[PDB]
Amino acid sequence: LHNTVMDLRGNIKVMCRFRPLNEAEILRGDKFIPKFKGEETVVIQGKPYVFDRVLPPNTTQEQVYNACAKQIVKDVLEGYNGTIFAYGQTSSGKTHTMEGKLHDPQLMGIIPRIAHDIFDHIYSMDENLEFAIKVSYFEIYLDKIRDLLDVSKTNLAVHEDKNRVPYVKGCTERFVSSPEEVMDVIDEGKSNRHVAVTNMNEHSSRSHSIFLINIKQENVETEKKLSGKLYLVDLAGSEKVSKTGAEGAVLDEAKNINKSLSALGNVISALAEGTTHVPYRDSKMTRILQDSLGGNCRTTIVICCSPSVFNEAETKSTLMFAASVNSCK
Amino acid sequence: RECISIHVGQAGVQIGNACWELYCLEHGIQPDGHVPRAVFVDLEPTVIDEVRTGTYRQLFHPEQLITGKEDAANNYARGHYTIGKEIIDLVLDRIRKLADQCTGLQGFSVFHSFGGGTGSGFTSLLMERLSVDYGKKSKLEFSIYPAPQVSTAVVEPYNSILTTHTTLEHSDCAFMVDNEAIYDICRRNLDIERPTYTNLNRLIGQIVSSITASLRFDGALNVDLTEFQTNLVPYPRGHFPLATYAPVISAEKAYHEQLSVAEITNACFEPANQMVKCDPRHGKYMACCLLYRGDVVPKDVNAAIATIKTKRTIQFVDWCPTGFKVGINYEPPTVVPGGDLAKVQRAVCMLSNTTAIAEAWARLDHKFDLMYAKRAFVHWYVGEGMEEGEFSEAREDMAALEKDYEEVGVDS
Amino acid sequence: REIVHIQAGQCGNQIGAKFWEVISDEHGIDPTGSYHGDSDLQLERINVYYNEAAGNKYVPRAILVDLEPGTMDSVRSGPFGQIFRPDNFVFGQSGAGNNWAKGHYTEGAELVDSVLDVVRKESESCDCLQGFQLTHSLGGGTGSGMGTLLISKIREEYPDRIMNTFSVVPSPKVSDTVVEPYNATLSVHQLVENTDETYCIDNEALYDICFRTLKLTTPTYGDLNHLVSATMSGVTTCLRFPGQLNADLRKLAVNMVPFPRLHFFMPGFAPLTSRGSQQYRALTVPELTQQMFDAKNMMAACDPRHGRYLTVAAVFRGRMSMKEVDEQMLNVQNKNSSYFVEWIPNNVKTAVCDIPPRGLKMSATFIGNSTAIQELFKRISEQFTAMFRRKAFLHWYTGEGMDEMEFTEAESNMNDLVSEYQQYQD
Numbered sequence A: 001l002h003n004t005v006m007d008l009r010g011n012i013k014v015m016c017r018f019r020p021l022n023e024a025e026i027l028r029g030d031k032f033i034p035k036f037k038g039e040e041t042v043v044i045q046g047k048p049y050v051f052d053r054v055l056p057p058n059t060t061q062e063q064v065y066n067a068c069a070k071q072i073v074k075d076v077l078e079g080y081n082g083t084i085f086a087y088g089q090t091s092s093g094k095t096h097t098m099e100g101k102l103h104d105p106q107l108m109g110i111i112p113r114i115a116h117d118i119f120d121h122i123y124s125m126d127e128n129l130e131f132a133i134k135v136s137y138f139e140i141y142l143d144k145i146r147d148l149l150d151v152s153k154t155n156l157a158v159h160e161d162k163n164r165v166p167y168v169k170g171c172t173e174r175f176v177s178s179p180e181e182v183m184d185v186i187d188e189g190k191s192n193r194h195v196a197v198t199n200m201n202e203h204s205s206r207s208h209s210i211f212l213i214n215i216k217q218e219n220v221e222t223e224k225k226l227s228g229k230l231y232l233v234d235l236a237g238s239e240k241v242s243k244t245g246a247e248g249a250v251l252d253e254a255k256n257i258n259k260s261l262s263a264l265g266n267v268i269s270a271l272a273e274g275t276t277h278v279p280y281r282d283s284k285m286t287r288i289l290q291d292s293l294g295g296n297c298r299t300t301i302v303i304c305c306s307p308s309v310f311n312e313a314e315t316k317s318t319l320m321f322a323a324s325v326n327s328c329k
Numbered sequence B: 001r002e003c004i005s006i007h008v009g010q011a012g013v014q015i016g017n018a019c020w021e022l023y024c025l026e027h028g029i030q031p032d033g034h035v036p037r038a039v040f041v042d043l044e045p046t047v048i049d050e051v052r053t054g055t056y057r058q059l060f061h062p063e064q065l066i067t068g069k070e071d072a073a074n075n076y077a078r079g080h081y082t083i084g085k086e087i088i089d090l091v092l093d094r095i096r097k098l099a100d101q102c103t104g105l106q107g108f109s110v111f112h113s114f115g116g117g118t119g120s121g122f123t124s125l126l127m128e129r130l131s132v133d134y135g136k137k138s139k140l141e142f143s144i145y146p147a148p149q150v151s152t153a154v155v156e157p158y159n160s161i162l163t164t165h166t167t168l169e170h171s172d173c174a175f176m177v178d179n180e181a182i183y184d185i186c187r188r189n190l191d192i193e194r195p196t197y198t199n200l201n202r203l204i205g206q207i208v209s210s211i212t213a214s215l216r217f218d219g220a221l222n223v224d225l226t227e228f229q230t231n232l233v234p235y236p237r238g239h240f241p242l243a244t245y246a247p248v249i250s251a252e253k254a255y256h257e258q259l260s261v262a263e264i265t266n267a268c269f270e271p272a273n274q275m276v277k278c279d280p281r282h283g284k285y286m287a288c289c290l291l292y293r294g295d296v297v298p299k300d301v302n303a304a305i306a307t308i309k310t311k312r313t314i315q316f317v318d319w320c321p322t323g324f325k326v327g328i329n330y331e332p333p334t335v336v337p338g339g340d341l342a343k344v345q346r347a348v349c350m351l352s353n354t355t356a357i358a359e360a361w362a363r364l365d366h367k368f369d370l371m372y373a374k375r376a377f378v379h380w381y382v383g384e385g386m387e388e389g390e391f392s393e394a395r396e397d398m399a400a401l402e403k404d405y406e407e408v409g410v411d412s
Numbered sequence C: 001r002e003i004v005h006i007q008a009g010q011c012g013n014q015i016g017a018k019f020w021e022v023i024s025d026e027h028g029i030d031p032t033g034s035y036h037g038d039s040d041l042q043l044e045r046i047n048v049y050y051n052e053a054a055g056n057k058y059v060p061r062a063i064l065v066d067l068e069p070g071t072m073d074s075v076r077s078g079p080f081g082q083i084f085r086p087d088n089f090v091f092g093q094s095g096a097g098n099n100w101a102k103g104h105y106t107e108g109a110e111l112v113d114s115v116l117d118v119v120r121k122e123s124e125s126c127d128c129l130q131g132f133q134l135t136h137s138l139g140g141g142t143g144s145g146m147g148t149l150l151i152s153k154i155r156e157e158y159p160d161r162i163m164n165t166f167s168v169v170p171s172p173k174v175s176d177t178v179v180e181p182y183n184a185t186l187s188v189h190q191l192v193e194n195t196d197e198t199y200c201i202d203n204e205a206l207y208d209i210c211f212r213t214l215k216l217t218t219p220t221y222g223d224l225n226h227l228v229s230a231t232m233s234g235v236t237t238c239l240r241f242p243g244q245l246n247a248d249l250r251k252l253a254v255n256m257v258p259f260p261r262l263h264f265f266m267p268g269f270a271p272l273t274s275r276g277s278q279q280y281r282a283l284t285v286p287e288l289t290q291q292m293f294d295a296k297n298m299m300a301a302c303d304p305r306h307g308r309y310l311t312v313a314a315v316f317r318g319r320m321s322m323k324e325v326d327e328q329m330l331n332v333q334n335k336n337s338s339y340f341v342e343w344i345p346n347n348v349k350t351a352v353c354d355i356p357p358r359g360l361k362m363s364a365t366f367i368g369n370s371t372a373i374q375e376l377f378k379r380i381s382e383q384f385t386a387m388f389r390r391k392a393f394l395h396w397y398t399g400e401g402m403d404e405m406e407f408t409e410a411e412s413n414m415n416d417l418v419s420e421y422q423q424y425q426d
């Protein structure tokens, strides 16, 4: 039993990733709250089943990448869409999973690995395929699309394609033909990302990030152009306004962005599981990633979570996201 | 000895002006006499202004009248977090400035309207900030929880499942008076299809007078505020008893007024007279505080109650032998000169915790889900400094309030 | 609190004259005179629509935007026309061409900055701003295009203050213009994405409601306008009055919009009886809900009976029993459980002012958010395609610096908007 309830199989679920504690904090104040059972249940308070998969505080970056992104990259190279969503609050491990360190042989994230696998097929399988890897990097800040390359545009617009599906026109794209140029785009975009001035350790994301890898491949013999889009969406942080006390800072401004986008989130998995079509074209995020939210099921949601007095908040929301589907039999 | 009061939300303020009226009325202190002992909060000026323009205009200090010219918003979030926040400090200041001036107080009788913006949200953090600044006192909040079918706001439940969960871990005893179930009383026990809000207010304005006013007033069987929560709450959940009044007879129509105790007390347990659509559909009482006032012989009571204790169809909880706090005052009630209240020489304002609300909460919780189930007006709160957390996590909250009010009863 | 009206285009303008014709009397403000107010209550809250300068001159705080002089020069050369401070008149002597594109990208885009300028002078007036009222017609240049721009800018300048929009959606039966669906589809687009409360009125839903619900045989425009202005007074201004249970733009907004689209409503007035005879006074209350909730009497074109409701706001304004009000609303909610959507236990938002419309005993504005309005954007959207397909009078747009993808955009958008709205009718 329990399998028939997997009606959600929509895969569009959200794999849980717990980050481990470092020795400096095991006895500072932060202690385990995550009890793991098997390799797919996490007991936090009252909770008898979780969902599809829980990655423990012993799961490698490589291991997270295999389950979550490796298939999505494979499908993208055949001309399909895929989405990888990322979520988790401050000190949950987001920076460590998506990029990690830019050149680290096994501590590197998702984006440097995809970049390595892309250029390992290129020049080994190009004899009729002419590849152009185009990267685009933009943020949604105050629900306006701010391009993060070239000259920062404080707003940027969508237009519609041949099928009447929207896409971000004018988004500055650039060629990348080796891994280095991809890193240089990341360094450029992060240096203008809206980050709250906390202590140096904390990285409080107030702007949601969309990293586009557009795998354009051209075929030389009469067959035409393919264009797989991999949307790597780094969600900005969620912070419990009640506790922190936003009087007036980019706390209030972030609270409105993170809540509007997480709410649209809720409807999108619920629709991706079973509903009639609904809140598309509501926000710019939704306008950027729509074609993926309807077809090639590859919108892996990778939510982080670190034991402690904190992170329990954003972890909880990450679990509440794809928890309902078929109930039951 | 005293008990401050914070009337929050237009409603809590209308009811406030009312309860505040009945007061001087039975204390011989006309328009301009002494000095109140409460405050008024609202994020919509025009309403507190009514206390600044209308009657009982100069009986207050423009200092105990807090307003936020800004916006009310019939949404918890905004009133609690975002906007409501800005005012709170200032608000507190008075309940700390008015709390100091006195002499060994007992608590703050809070007046709010569960399903509002300024009433649900705001207070939520007002009572919140109190439970910490004066944990060592009484926090009896007098609420006007959501009409069972005749609600107003479209969101109401969002605002009331949220004022309950945030205040729950902060109140001492929460009195409840159902707006609709009071209308019935105005239709069935007074006859009038013309009940202005100004009436329901005169009513609670009565039942309330029986709580503080007269009780804090000498008598043959005094009952302190603490007394309540002690003799009234079996468990830490800021338990919510129900308010009921006895001689709710019409001062025009019928006239049997002279309705000796033996009668007015029986008239409290019949469900059609309790300012709450929580008809004892099964809810076993677990403690009642029969506050009497006027000419009453203790034996009359210690008999009229005895007769009741043995009606059985009035089934009291198991774990409770005797749950009847008999509060006797002297001075009879005091009806508005010419409203529509009979004016007897004795009354029974009995309040109690009844496993009955197992219902009322249920029916109000369910509401919530239906909408949350579709997020309905969710974007209105999120965009106001709230999250999927506060809702879902305040739903789970009440869930254990449906189990609580179930376990403490129905079982032996 | 406060608000700043906006008279975009001629229509939106013509109506301005009627909205202010009324409102003033509902506030005792003579042409340039002051507050003659029969009472003293029609003053403690005026601010919402005026400003203090002289001491007898409370000037309406609205904006008059239009690219056709003659118009504003008819509104400024007639009755109350001499109460607006000239600074308010943001004219565009250019050719006010009937092109959405001519008043949104080419001609209007210039006059915009000289507008925003004032919309800021008025916003930064004093106290605290609530939102802006916007009148116009979605079937012309200065209306749909330039007015639809005015907001897209307003909503970037104060994404906090609200935005009520009073649109005269293109009446069905007969279109008082030809490209209508062009100027329309293009403006609704802008609406569904900036203003957060829209009250759609139909010149022919009015006629009807004005020729059969008012035996009125010669319903001049002035009238229609007058009727409309009657509703927008019940909405705003009204709630800025006391009440057993009062609300205000937000309450109205925060109780009426379940989903961010912005959604459009359909206003309905209460006592709508013919002069002499009819003066039946059957206005105890069941008579007002009788009214408000019937098909006819909905300023919209579509009929509620053709689609559930999401929210309803009976904004009454006249001494009544919070019992006979709160009660009625219920039976109403049960006699028609069929159409009233279920996932909202209490769709209705009862509101209750005190003072009524100057000369009347009891009234009640109705602001319905029914799914029925699906069957209107459908209409509009249809007309588009049937003519877009052949690019009918498209050269007047493109030739004005437009895009073949712009029209595509709007239709789709507004077209999807139809879709969604059905997601609840079911």
Ligand SMILES: CC(=O)O[C@H]1C(=O)[C@@]2(C)[C@H]([C@H](OC(=O)c3ccccc3)[C@]3(O)C[C@H](OC(=O)[C@H](O)[C@@H](NC(=O)c4ccccc4)c4ccccc4)C(C)=C1C3(C)C)[C@]1(OC(C)=O)CO[C@@H]1C[C@@H]2O
Pocket: C021, C022, C023, C025, C026, C214, C222, C223, C224, C226, C227, C228, C229, C230, C231, C233, C234, C271, C272, C273, C274, C275, C276, C279, C356, C357, C358, C359, C360
């Ligand atoms: C002797 C008497 O009682 O006369 C009434 C009257 O006969 C009736 C027929 C009025 C009359 O209204 C109309 O005939 C009408 C004309 C064009 C468009 C719409 C309506 C009246 O003109 C309208 C007028 O309305 C008001 O005074 C309100 O305050 C109203 N004011 C205006 O619309 C207004 C008109 C001119 C100049 C300035 C303002 C209002 C309503 C809502 C919000 C704000 C203001 C009233 C009660 C009457 C007359 C004078 C005959 C009615 O309308 C209103 C809006 O009240 C029509 O059905 C109602 C029922 C009324 O009993």
Ligand SMILES: Nc1nc2c(ncn2[C@@H]2O[C@H](COP(=O)(O)OP(=O)(O)OP(=O)(O)O)[C@@H](O)[C@H]2O)c(=O)[nH]1
Pocket: B008, B009, B010, B011, B012, B014, B015, B043, B044, B072, B073, B074, B075, B079, B113, B115, B116, B117, B118, B119, B120, B144, B146, B147, B151, B152, B179, B197, B198, B200, B201, B204, C244, C245, C246
């Ligand atoms: N008994 C009684 N109930 C009232 C009175 N006024 C309002 N109510 C009820 O309380 C609720 C109304 O709350 P509102 O007046 O909308 O709001 P508020 O709580 O004052 O605060 P805001 O939403 O910010 O204006 C409804 O359920 C009314 O039925 C009153 O004078 N007496």
Ligand SMILES: Nc1ncnc2c1ncn2[C@@H]1O[C@H](COP(=O)(O)OP(=O)(O)NP(=O)(O)O)[C@@H](O)[C@H]1O
Pocket: A019, A020, A088, A089, A090, A091, A092, A093, A094, A095, A096, A097, A201, A202, A203, A204, A205, A237, A304
């Ligand atoms: N698996 C891991 N191994 C070693 N260090 C890690 C690991 N995961 C996270 N960290 C470190 O712990 C901190 C959390 O990093 P990141 O900086 O990854 O957090 P978020 O990105 O979780 N934070 P925030 O963006 O503020 O909401 C950083 O100092 C990381 O270098």
Ligand SMILES: Nc1nc2c(ncn2[C@@H]2O[C@H](COP(=O)(O)OP(=O)(O)O)[C@@H](O)[C@H]2O)c(=O)[nH]1
Pocket: C008, C009, C010, C011, C012, C014, C015, C096, C097, C098, C137, C139, C140, C141, C142, C143, C144, C168, C170, C171, C175, C176, C177, C203, C221, C224, C225
């Ligand atoms: N109710 C109403 N509609 C009007 C008025 N004037 C024009 N209209 C309507 O507006 C449409 C024409 O647009 P118009 O206002 O001339 O556009 P613009 O002046 O170029 O912005 C037609 O559908 C008319 O019925 C008016 O005073 N009242």
Ligand SMILES: [Mg+2]
Pocket: A093, A094, A095, A203, A205
């Ligand atoms: Mg991070």
Ligand SMILES: [Mg+2]
Pocket: B009, B010, B011, B042, B044, B047, B072, B118
């Ligand atoms: Mg109020």
